[PDB]
Design goal:
With 87 residues, the chain is mainly alpha-helical. It has a single domain (1-87), classed as TAZ domain (CREB-binding Protein, Chain A, Up-down Bundle), CATH 1.20.1020. It is built from 5 helices and no strands. α1 (2-22) crosses α2 (31-45) and α1 (2-22) packs across α4 (55-70). The structure holds zinc ion (3 copies). One zinc ion (ZN) binds at residues 42-43, 46, 48, 54, 56-57. One zinc ion binds at residues 67-68, 71, 73, 76, 78, 81. It is classed as transcription.
């Protein structure tokens, strides 16, 4: 169903995020990994985040949020995860 498809797509994106966060290898081939890294870097740099209402940052934060809901591991490399869980 549309919702399921979206949830799966989100989860697959999350797998890429999770991979990328752990993948301390700038030489990684994975376009998805490179993309996630770039998005993460962008977000960290873009202090404006959800204050300015930056779509990139908003998406990363939402992705991280959904990830956090799934991720009971309150010792996760993924940024925001921990903060969201505690919050
Ligand atoms: Zn990688
Ligand atoms: Zn931004
Ligand atoms: Zn996590």
């Amino acid at each position: 169903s549309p919702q399921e498809s979206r949830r799966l797509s989100i989860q697959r994106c999350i797998q890429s995020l999770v991979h990328a966060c752990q993948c301390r290898n700038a030489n990684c081939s994975l376009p998805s990994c490179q993309k996630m890294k770039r998005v993460v870097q962008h977000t960290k740099g873009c202090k404006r985040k959800t204050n300015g209402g930056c779509p990139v940052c908003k998406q990363l934060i939402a992705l991280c949020c959904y990830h956090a809901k799934h991720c009971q591991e309150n010792k996760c490399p993924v940024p925001f995860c921990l903060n969201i869980k505690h919050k």
